[PDB]
């Protein structure tokens, strides 16, 4: 149930989000994937009297998704329309590696 990472194209982080979210319910796996968060920051685009606060994704192309490691979970997650593939080539690239929990908590500071 650790926090893993995934890779999307570019600008498809929220499409990937919605897709995965709904799929988990339609495909029927509300017991492996639990939480999805896309890290995002802020950009002050004031037009001298008109604020904006537009999406400024700190890590463009990377969506961290908590997932219990299995096999069909890997299938549904990686085959969601939009994701390029998993991360974690530390061991050649066979299985993803769980992101250091402390690093996850520091990423979730905001």
């Amino acid at each position: 149930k650790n926090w893993y990472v995934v890779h999307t194209y570019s600008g498809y982080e929220n499409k990937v989000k919605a897709n995965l979210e709904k799929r988990v319910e339609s495909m029927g796996m509300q017991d492996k994937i639990f939480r999805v968060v896309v890290p995002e920051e802020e950009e002050t685009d004031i037009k001298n009297g008109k604020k904006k606060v537009v999406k400024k994704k700190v890590f463009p192309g990377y969506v961290l998704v908590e997932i219990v490691m299995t096999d069909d979970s890997w299938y549904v997650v990686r085959n969601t329309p939009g994701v390029t593939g998993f991360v974690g080539s530390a061991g050649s690239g066979s299985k993803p590696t769980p992101l250091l929990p402390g690093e996850a908590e520091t990423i979730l500071k905001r």
């Binding site: 080539s89 530390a90 061991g91 050649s92 690239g93 590696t97």
Partner: protein, 195 residues
């Protein structure tokens, strides 16, 4: 970040591999972020903290074994008390013997577990002791373990930035006279490799 010229690494033969004395598969693994390598290992401090950490690791292993003993103690005691308050008096002593067999199987499981942890610590010690430059260390777990316990002395990383360090700390002359000594008095196929 530094990169590597394709001409001097993916050739026939590999000129970088011939200069650094590394197999092409090892170079491919290091360059493309799939394994670690030890850039340098301090041999002075290590040669003293050798005995120092020998003592330390003996202590650690003792602690580990004693914790095993204690868990064994607790669990065994409780189980035996339970099975003693009732030696399956409704049928025969054999049902209690069978649950005692189950308990002993559990015992042996925990035994194997702790023993394997012991030999993995042994592996740790081995790897950390006899460690020389240019020694591919696969498995991220092992690397992080070593960098947690004995994070000093040895250094290393992966990527082309870790090959720049190996090339920078390289002495051509010593290797040249070493190869000439090998060619002078040698036979077999090591002479062909030296040539």
């Amino acid at each position: 970040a530094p990169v590597t010229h394709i001409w001097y690494f993916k050739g026939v033969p590999s000129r970088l591999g011939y200069l650094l004395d590394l197999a092409p598969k090892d170079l491919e693994k290091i360059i493309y972020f799939a394994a670690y390598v030890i850039t340098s290992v301090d041999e002075e401090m290590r040669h003293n903290e050798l005995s120092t950490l020998e003592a330390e690791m003996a202590v650690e292993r003792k602690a580990v074994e004693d914790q095993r003993d204690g868990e064994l103690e607790a669990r065994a005691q409780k189980l035996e008390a339970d099975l003693a308050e009732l030696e399956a008096e409704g049928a025969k002593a054999d049902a209690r013997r069978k649950v005692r067999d189950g308990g002993e199987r559990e015992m042996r499981q925990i035994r194997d577990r702790a023993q394997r942890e012991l030999d993995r610590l042994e592996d740790i010690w081995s790897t950390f002791t006899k460690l020389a430059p240019k020694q591919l260390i696969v498995d991220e777990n092992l690397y992080r373990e070593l960098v947690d316990r004995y994070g000093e002395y040895f250094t290393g990383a992966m990527g082309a930035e870790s090959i720049q360090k190996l090339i920078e700390n390289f002495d051509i002359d010593a290797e040249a006279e070493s190869l000439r000594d090998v060619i002078r008095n040698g036979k077999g196929q090591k002479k062909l490799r030296a040539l």
